[PDB]
Amino acid sequence: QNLKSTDRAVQQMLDKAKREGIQTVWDRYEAMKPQCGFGETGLCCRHCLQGPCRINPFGDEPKVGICGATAEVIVARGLDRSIAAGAAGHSGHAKHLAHTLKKAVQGKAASYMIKDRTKLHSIAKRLGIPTEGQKDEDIALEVAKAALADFHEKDTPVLWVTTVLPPSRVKVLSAHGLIPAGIDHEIAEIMHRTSMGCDADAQNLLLGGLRCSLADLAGCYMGTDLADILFGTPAPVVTESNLGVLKADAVNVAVHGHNPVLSDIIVSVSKEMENEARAAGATGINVVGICCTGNEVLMRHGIPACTHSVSQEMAMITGALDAMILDYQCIQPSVATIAECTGTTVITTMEMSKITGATHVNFAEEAAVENAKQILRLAIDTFKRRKGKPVEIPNIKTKVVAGFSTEAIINALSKLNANDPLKPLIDNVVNGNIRGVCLFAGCNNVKVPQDQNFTTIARKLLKQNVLVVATGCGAGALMRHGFMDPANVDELCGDGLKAVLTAIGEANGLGGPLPPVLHMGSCVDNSRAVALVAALANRLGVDLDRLPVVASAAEAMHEKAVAIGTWAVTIGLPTHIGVLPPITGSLPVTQILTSSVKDITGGYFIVELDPETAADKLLAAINERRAGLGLPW
Amino acid sequence: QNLKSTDRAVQQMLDKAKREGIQTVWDRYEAMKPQCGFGETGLCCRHCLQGPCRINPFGDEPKVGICGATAEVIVARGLDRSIAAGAAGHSGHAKHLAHTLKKAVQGKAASYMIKDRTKLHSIAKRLGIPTEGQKDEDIALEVAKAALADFHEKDTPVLWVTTVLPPSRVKVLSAHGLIPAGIDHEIAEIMHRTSMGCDADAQNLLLGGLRCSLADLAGCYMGTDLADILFGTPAPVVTESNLGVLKADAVNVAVHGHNPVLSDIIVSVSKEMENEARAAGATGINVVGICCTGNEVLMRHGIPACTHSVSQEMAMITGALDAMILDYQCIQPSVATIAECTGTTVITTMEMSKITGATHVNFAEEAAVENAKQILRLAIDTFKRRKGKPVEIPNIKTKVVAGFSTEAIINALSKLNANDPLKPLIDNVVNGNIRGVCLFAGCNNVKVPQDQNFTTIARKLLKQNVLVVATGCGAGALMRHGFMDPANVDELCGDGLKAVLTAIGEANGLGGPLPPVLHMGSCVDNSRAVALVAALANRLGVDLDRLPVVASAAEAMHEKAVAIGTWAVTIGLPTHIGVLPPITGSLPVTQILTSSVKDITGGYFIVELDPETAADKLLAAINERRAGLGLPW
Ligand code: SF4
Ligand code: SF4
Ligand code: FES
């Protein structure tokens, strides 16, 4: 089982699933081998009913699509659609919070409110929305209106791109026509230009992909902005992770998916239904996190993370998961059938994300507290039904220090320099105590032993004094392996990085250091890393493509991950991906994305499946940036 | 070659291509056989980097996607994306005309103007835009603003759905949540809900598809509305079709693609550059049509149609095609490489639709007349370069009576009843002279011998007195085989239908009948058939799902075709498709789309690859509707 997952809790549940006959994600993968080579290389097109068309990577015919579409067009078209799909998920998430915020301050849904007034006013200022003399509800109305306005064409480009990157970066992108005109506008244009008989030039197609990836960035940043207004900007918090956070004697409720509009309410309402769970024989209601909705409520509330990504089914296999409350994205639809075996009540809540065999509860903000209690009552019902059935919770969990929003990082650094808080970080980059910055982002992928690339790469970078930050299921990986516990700083961190984490921690009154990896939140909160990196760029007076900052989608899976990796490249970052995207079928496309794009945006993809090699390549990328700034390395 | 195409001109050029070594669409198809069975059945998913996932139609594993996605989810997700892609093409076309119209009446692009004031005022009234006391430029501003507004969420649903179908049909669709909220909004929502780990219920997924197909309808109808304002509502016109319209002694210029914003200007400017072509040794400039841009300028100006769809390369093979002027959609990218062999200058003009090896001319409305002359001068240059090279134009063409906009049909029928023009048509449906109505729409498909399904089905329906109308490449097929020449009415038409076409023609002063098939325009002009059918519904006081009207995408190809077929079903029509869409891998999905959907919208797909059987099935569908109205059949 260590070939399936490096996580010992997951291993334990895989043995349980095997003796019980419950098929897993790993079993379905084995049954899919060998996977289709045309798909894997990207040399397959089904964009019209003349297909499927495929192209032999090598050999004789077929060499070209029926309509004349070459390998390089086919590959670029498939990649563009995946970016557009990722953008559609992140911007749909954001759009929904915009409507939620609009409803809140119009009196429609009193369960929602402006919780972070500072953030609301700073977003308004960033957007140009007057705040002087306005009521908060009216500024917030203007911010939600502006959020919704960025989805379509208008007299301005997308403001959640042009106001969040340095003018120098916006100018670079504008010269190449890469600023998005509207978020859903770019999604649609991709689907059009990639449809049969339209765009058939690889460079033109990929320029479209870059622009649509910036539409995805805009949705990410909008989602983080709006969720912070509504639910509070994260600050440092201590909690726990992995399956051992499940409690046999409690009603265990997993919140799973991406958008926290529901599960933030679940968190608060659960705390009151406490005596009602006690009446059913439980100690209380134990909300635990799965995937990015879990990250959201861990970041803000310290809700413990149960598991992540590829291993999500394993939470159910314990026998103690009474309820799994779903919104959308990254939810294995196998969960609905596994619940038949495990007794877990699986509940969908979003109209466009249903799963056959799951109970649906039609969430509406206007009734959130009521929907919350209906769900938690179904969970209390399931806890009652497993009286006297033994459970198998692996007694395995890690301590997790999380909550490092960009505002939190700046405040933590402010304790070392009050009026210039980025300077202590830059100082230590210059002097070498911090070699660079690496953002780990993205999913697990069944093709990679779970977490093996994240932990292998992170270990090698931390030993070389790289400041490591993490979001989404990359942060999930690192937390489950102890990388967010400050007691592991001695083991994991190089001397210089240890010195910096220690200095910052001691100055924030904790007598111990910051944890080895900084948890910056969910997938949309990759926008927070952009905020930090752009603030560094502006404080230094250079563009992002001169900074010793890189990103790693070390175990990428979702179309969202492809979109993030692409806008990481587009804002100027060297960007590693540890799984093969479907591009190897075209050398010209590969060469654009890993080399030529450097001359456009300054960033580039680093495709490397071997994690020890990937780290060496990321460190060379960091050290090249150091050398370009005239720093020792 | 009769196995490749039923068109004798195409046959002639296929022999030429063969002896000259020029690879065709048919050669690339042969080289692709056998095509992938998983693709063909829809049992393949590449929506994340854990794939490609496939499912064996039958046998042993793989039975399910790696993430747990079943056959029915995978099939419904693939189909939803194709609908969203089709919607993206038709609505992108429409959006571009909206911006063109806005520019026109703001003084920015004097080459464009309000040409059909009646249409502008009727659209304004239909939308609720005040016209009383307004300048035309201001009404037109309001119409373009409203067009652009339908792409995003707002306080109203998409008006180019809710104002163009009967209240009874809107109510049926609203009850099931199928009214689109915004055109690009629905495109994005599809791409989101179909992304990994989101919607996983076939019925929910397909309900999303229906709604997004209505977004496609809205873009179609918006495109027709705006193009009519800008370029004139079609009225009956006489011209010619097929390769014999090429002229060795002229500069032959094909306009090819879908959006006529450019080629309408090409048409007019060519007429003046006449003496400049004479100076180069030509008789003049002969603009000819390919695909739906060709249809647009045939409908409005009588420009002759050269060819269509699958056989577009064959125009170049004559040796006399000096220039092919491209916008977007349905353009085989092989044209760019074939031009090396044929000498044809291939020119792209739209920023999001480039082809490697083609000359690009950056069209902008603000400079259209100038861009027009630059292009036509490149074409005059190519004519000069083929002095003394023999050409092989097949001496084959048909006479084409076209221009049957819904306004034109109503006016033609008004000559038989001035104040109730739909009544003469209904009268003859009731008495049986008109058995029903069949709309042929969509593309050719290399899988089907070119035009064989269109002509086989049309012949059998015309003999059974069905009124036949046609758009897009279905109309292209029928025109090239003589179905738009009134001299073929005796041969082709049943006695009762002949009587009606004759009565209407004689009453419009032509001493002969209407042609056997009514050409209603391009693909977006499938919206015109909706206008006619909805007007019939309203005049009769019943919903469209009670009318003896059906549609046939007899040789479907493009994702646009899938979107049209789906909204034909969604507005209540029995809808034949003559090529296999990728749905047979899922019986439950097939059963929804061909049977259960009837209980939602009243329409349904008829999947039938054998054209004689398809016609029998369409006639049974017509006759069932007749019986439901209590009419003999
Ligand atoms: S778009 Fe071209 S390459 Fe793709 S399936 Fe259709 S014919 Fe084949
Ligand atoms: S979305 Fe599911 S079925 Fe599709 S490729 Fe990914 S794992 Fe396979
Ligand atoms: S041939 Fe396998 S992905 Fe299409």
Ligand code: FES
């Ligand atoms: S396996 Fe052939 S279409 Fe994917």
Ligand SMILES: [Fe+2]
């Ligand atoms: Fe996630």
Ligand SMILES: [Fe+2]
């Ligand atoms: Fe077309």
